[PDB]
């Protein structure tokens with residue numbers, strides 16, 4: 519089997535991407551944030567605290583003849599950005615782009631943090647990291663990919679995010695029309711539960727390539743590109759007027775600037791991030807100071823190949839017995 523779904527930016531900055539997901543019988547369609555940085559499928563629901571729901575589409579398990587309460591199970595997640603949610607669990611039929619999983623654990627939110635309430639465009643998350651990070655207790659649950667894998671034509675999914683435009687999540691097959699050149703695969707460590715790999719280096723704009731190992735994770739659920747302070751400093755040093763601002767919380771730059779590209783290595787291959795992909799607009803409405811799309815990972819504990827980077831590539835998440843990651847230009 520295979521599945522193919524369109525993923526759409528939630529706003530004009532590509533702050534995140536939502537993919538429609540069918541849950542239950544009859545289907546209830548919710549727009550979820552596919553996150554290869556986490557491993558919980560959770561949704562806004564008829565159980566969520568009233569005051570914490572503002573615009574979201576909710577899952578109502580009582581209206582689904584295939585929903586079953588997973589007795590005693592609870593879940594609680596805290597993301598790297600300080601956001602969080604928690605609640606109880608059902609199993610139900612979940613379909614993504616024509617691909618169906620029966621008995622998928624659907625984590626029903628009773629509580630969500632302010633930042634989730636405040637974004638009416640995201641109805642929940644669908645995690646695509648390794649199930650070792652799943653937060654369900656006392657019986658840890660499998661991710662959608664994990665549940666479908668044996669059934670897929672090939673045990674893979676692919677992320678094809680667009681820049682200021684919709685893209686595609688495919689399951690069980692690689693679309694050889696969606697990229698240029700060849701796909702370069704690279705080793706993954708599953709030790710921390712993430713799609714963790716090692717980039718071979720970078721270049722700034724038309725700069726020379728610097729050979730250097732950068733360990734990080736492929737994270738579709740993180741918007742920006744978070745790299746070592748040295749790297750980030752070398753990038754913003756090419757933009758006149760750019761500065762690290764503690765008060766805004768990162769590198770900002772004059773909105774009148776033309777940003778240079780950023781290249782990262784994948785083995786002997788190179789992925790080029792165009793300068794415009796690194797512009798995240800005024801720091802506040804009407805400001806002529808713009809927020810940078812490349813930021814320091816110092817203080818995070820890990821480097822993150824966030825959407826800013828992934829959207830410049832066609833990315834293969836190969837969940838074979840020994841997982842690997844694949845990157846192609848497009």
Ligand SMILES: O=C(CN1CCCCC1)Nc1ccc2c(c1)OCO2
Pocket residue numbers: 553555597598599600601735737739740741818820822
């Ligand atoms: O919290 C996030 C992303 N976040 C995920 C939940 C929705 C809002 C965006 N960043 C993040 C993502 C993966 C990480 C990490 C931090 O530290 C380690 O792995």
